[PDB]
Amino acid sequence: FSAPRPSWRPAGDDTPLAGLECATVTVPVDHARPDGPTLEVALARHPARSAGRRRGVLLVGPDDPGNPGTLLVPQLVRDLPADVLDGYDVVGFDHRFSGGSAPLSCGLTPDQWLWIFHRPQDVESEARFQRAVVERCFDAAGDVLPYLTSRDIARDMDVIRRALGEDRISYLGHSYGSYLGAVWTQMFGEHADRVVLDSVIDPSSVWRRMFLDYAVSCEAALERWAHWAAERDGELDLGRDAPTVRAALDALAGRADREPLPVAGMPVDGTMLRLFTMVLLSSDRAWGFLGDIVRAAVHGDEAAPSTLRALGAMFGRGKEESGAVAQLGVLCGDAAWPRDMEVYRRDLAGHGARHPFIGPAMAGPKAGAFWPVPPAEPVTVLGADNRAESVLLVQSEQDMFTPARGARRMRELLAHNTRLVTLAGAVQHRVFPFHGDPGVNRAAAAYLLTGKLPDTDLTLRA
Ligand SMILES: COC1=CC(C)=C2[C@@H](Nc3ccc(O)c4c3C(=O)c3ccccc3C4=O)C#CCCC#C[C@H]1[C@@H]2C=O
């Protein structure tokens, strides 16, 4: 496919990309039909600060499906070690049908944007709720949704590499970006220079198995936070023991299921409240925020303005329906979900009830069960034939969203070309470089700049 060189221009100082460059790259909707329709994939670049030390391009993928990867470049400019920013053009992209790359709008209600985490009433009612999301999105975008897959994004990534005029390219990806990098190396690894995958999705869990295991991780994180909160009943007044704290949290969410809780003039229902809980759960540096909002909502008080500025971030003016549709296409389209409602009925009553905070939303009949198109391709198989010269895995020992088991699995599947750096003591998600750990950042920067993996898998302590 014809990949002309991008037309870089300074991003406006009225944008979150101020100080960077912006461009688009043309990709075909159907990579098998390169003369068919196309779309423009948005890019953002921070050029290497030192031409004499320039190694090439560090391509950066989105960290969640639907999350604009261009917005990672300012975060990376802020936190990356200086010699990395000296040596690489940092180039982030918004994956097809998200962000500024032809985002989709299908008329979804705000309640439907949270289809992943939606609390079910029963199998019958949730099957109706989730199928409705599918039929709504296919009514408005059924022409392109079959081309919103992880492998098609990986195809876009190689068009971008060629449009940038690079024979070899480096890659950094977090969470979903770790999977995009893995898939891209399996498909195009002969073009890989240095690769860092951080907070590593288990590539054998695509995707329902990941849903089910997340319910377990969430329970474990809630138990560690309930103990932490219990040790602080003298500030939060939620209980002097974890089960008492959990019971308060549980009842709060139960009321929110009945009646939306007014938070700074916006209704917060049980699904939204549980989502805010889980996001704050994922980093122990955010556990104080969680204590604050639970304390306030329980006692009918107001949360600190700082706490609300995290809530306004995830469900106020920032939020986008385009992200929910992007999640739908990737999560339902990469692999065929079980169609039989018996599977979901049983898993709700067993696994869901055993992991009650988010288990029911994870085990019940999700939109993928009702997908109207067959899978276009198998799930990418990672293995010994991966042609990437080297891949560094970076992983927090305690990560609620992408547990360390996924990184360990990737380390086995790609045993021939990977090394694993684990950060112990970290209750964190997305480590390099945003966590600011000197050990992790030094090791990852040395690899990116020398191309040398650690001699052995490393376990560092924060
Ligand atoms: C591959 O698809 C996904 C992978 C992972 C790990 C997903 C992960 N959610 C997140 C993982 C890391 C995050 O920082 C976040 C989120 C959010 O949900 C989120 C929602 C609203 C505001 C902020 C966040 C958020 O900050 C969880 C779970 C279960 C099923 C599915 C899928 C999506 C899904 C994120 O996209």
β-strand 88-93 against 56-60: which pairing, if any?
Answer: parallel
Pocket around ligand 1: residues whose beta carbon is below 6 Å from it? 64-65, 116, 175-176, 211, 214, 275, 279, 314, 327, 331, 401-402, 429
CB 458 within 8 A of CB 446: no
Quote the CA–CA distance of 249 and 130 in Å, as a whole number.
27
Q: Which residue, judged by its Cα, is nearest atom 16 of ligand 1?
A: 279
Residue 12 dihedral angles phi and psi, to the nearest 5°: -65, 145
Residue 192 β-bridge partners:
169
* Residue 372 structure tokens: 């109207």
> What domains appear along the chain, each with residue ranges and CATH number?
9-103+150-205+382-461 (3.40.50.1820), 110-143+320-370 (no CATH), 208-315 (no CATH)
Q: Which residue has the tokens 């053009």?
A: 89
CB 448 within 8 A of CB 58: yes
Q: Which residue, judged by its Cα, is nearest atom 13 of ligand 1?
A: 279
Choice from 151, 197, 279, 315 to test ligand 1 binding pocket (greatest atom count within 8 A of CB): 279
**Header resolution in angstroms:** 2.0
* Residue 453 structure tokens: 């993996």
Q: Ligand 1 centroid vs 33 CA: distance in angstroms?
A: 32
Q: Ligand 1 centroid vs 178 CA: distance in angstroms?
A: 13
Q: Which residue, judged by its Cα, is nearest atom 15 of ligand 1?
A: 279
Q: Ligand 1 centroid vs 64 CA: distance in angstroms?
A: 6
Write the single-letter amino acid at 89: D
Quote the CA–CA distance of 423 and 230 in Å, as a whole number.
26
Q: Ligand 1 centroid vs 221 CA: distance in angstroms?
A: 15
Q: Which long-range contacts (CB under 8 A, 24 or more apart) does 349-354 make?
A: 351/212, 351/215, 352/215
Choice from 63, 64, 319 to test ligand 1 binding pocket (greatest atom count within 8 A of CB): 64
* Residue 296 structure tokens: 């306030």
Q: Could you write out the three-class secondary structure of the chain?
A: CCCCCCCCEECCCCCCCCCCEEEEEEEECCCCCCCCCEEEEEEEEECCCCCCCCCEEEEECCCCCCCCHHHHHHHHHHHCCHHHHHHEEEEEECCCCECCECCCCCCCCHHHHCCCCCCCCCHHHHHHHHHHHHHHHHHHHCCCHHHCCHHHHHHHHHHHHHHCCCCCEEEEEEEHHHHHHHHHHHHHHHHEEEEEEEEECCCCCCCHHHHHHHHHHHHHHHHHHHHHHHCCHHHHCCCCCHHHHHHHHHHHHHHHHHCCEEECCEEECHHHHHHHHHHHHCCHHHHHHHHHHHHHHHCCCCCCHHHHHHHHHHHCCCCCHHHHHHHHHHHHHCCCCCCCHHHHHHHHHHHHHHCCCCHHHHHCCCHHHHCCCCCCCCCCCCCCCCCCCCEEEEEEEECCCCCHHHHHHHHHHCCCCEEEEEEEEEECCCCCCCCCCHHHHHHHHHHHHHCCCCCCCEEEEC
Q: Which residue, judged by its Cα, is nearest atom 5 of ligand 1?
A: 401
Choice from 149, 153, 175, 276 to test ligand 1 binding pocket (greatest atom count within 8 A of CB): 175
Q: Which residue has the tokens 């112990």?
A: 424
Quote the CA–CA distance of 281 and 119 in Å, as a whole number.
18
Quote the CA–CA distance of 177 and 64 in Å, as a whole number.
7
Closest CA to 68 of 16, 146, 30: 16
Q: Which residue, judged by its Cα, is nearest atom 8 of ligand 1?
A: 401
Contacts of 45 (CB under 8 A, 6+ apart): 8, 20, 21, 22, 23, 73, 89, 90, 91
For residue 402, the ligand 1 atom closest to its alpha carbon is: 6
Q: Which residue, judged by its Cα, is nearest atom 27 of ligand 1?
A: 401
Q: Ligand 1 centroid vs 205 CA: distance in angstroms?
A: 15
Q: Ligand 1 centroid vs 116 CA: distance in angstroms?
A: 9
Q: Could you write out the three-class secondary structure of 289-329?
A: HHHHHHHHHHCCCCCCHHHHHHHHHHHCCCCCHHHHHHHHH
Q: Which residue, judged by its Cα, is nearest atom 29 of ligand 1?
A: 211
CB 370 within 8 A of CB 127: yes
For residue 201, the ligand 1 atom closest to its alpha carbon is: 6
Quote the CA–CA distance of 382 and 185 in Å, as a whole number.
9
Q: Ligand 1 centroid vs 195 CA: distance in angstroms?
A: 23
Residue 9 β-bridge partners:
22
For residue 66, the ligand 1 atom closest to its alpha carbon is: 36
Quote the CA–CA distance of 387 and 383 in Å, as a whole number.
10
Burial of residue 82, with CB atoms counted within 10 A of its CB: 0-12 exposed, 13-18 middle, 19 or more buried: exposed
> Considering just the CA atoms, what is the radius of gyration of the chain in Å?
22
CB 420 within 8 A of CB 395: yes
Start-to-end C-alpha separation, the chain: 46
Q: Which residue has the tokens 């907070």?
A: 199
Angle among Cα 80, 437, 421 to the nearest 5 degrees reads: 95
Contacts of 38 (CB under 8 A, 6+ apart): 26, 27, 28, 29
Residue 5 dihedral angles phi and psi, to the nearest 5°: -65, 140
For residue 214, the ligand 1 atom closest to its alpha carbon is: 29
Quote the CA–CA distance of 426 and 459 in Å, as a whole number.
12
For residue 401, the ligand 1 atom closest to its alpha carbon is: 6
Task: Output the CA–CA distances (angstroms, integers) from residue 99 to 71, 93, 145, 364, in the order listed.
Answer: 9, 9, 15, 29
- Cβ-count burial 185-214 (b if 16+ within 10 Å, e if not): bbbbbebbbbbbbbbbbbbebbbbebbbbb
For residue 67, the ligand 1 atom closest to its alpha carbon is: 36
β-strand 418-427 against 391-398: which pairing, if any?
Answer: parallel
Quote the CA–CA distance of 217 and 48 in Å, as a whole number.
39
For residue 314, the ligand 1 atom closest to its alpha carbon is: 22
